[PDB]
Amino acid sequence: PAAPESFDEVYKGRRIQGRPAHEHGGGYEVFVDGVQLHVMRNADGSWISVVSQYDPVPTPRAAARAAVDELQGAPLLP
């Protein structure tokens, strides 16, 4: 499958970024305020992440936004 497009935006006050590229070897990378958020693509082309692991979302940007939603302001840890 094609790699998703990169993105860069401020969402709920935090900078979220995505780009094509202990954990699998990532084909796509997401960052929240510069700290990497581990994300993974599912067979059906949806995504999850460590911060929201059991609830598929359609895109890496959706996973970034879901992570920022759940973090409620907390810094991510590498």
Contacts to other proteins by CB under 8 A:
22-25, 38, 40-44, 49-56, 70-72, 74-77
Sheet of 7-11: strand order equals 7-11, 14-20, 28-32, 35-37
**In the complex, least distance from residue 63 CB atom to other proteins, rounded to whole angstroms:** 12
Residues 6 or more apart whose Cβ sits within 8 Å of residue 62: 47
**In the complex, least distance from residue 5 CB atom to other proteins, rounded to whole angstroms:** 20
**In the complex, least distance from residue 78 CB atom to other proteins, rounded to whole angstroms:** 9
Task: Kindly tell me which of 22 and 34 has the beta carbon lying closer to other proteins.
Answer: 22
Name the residue type at position 8: D
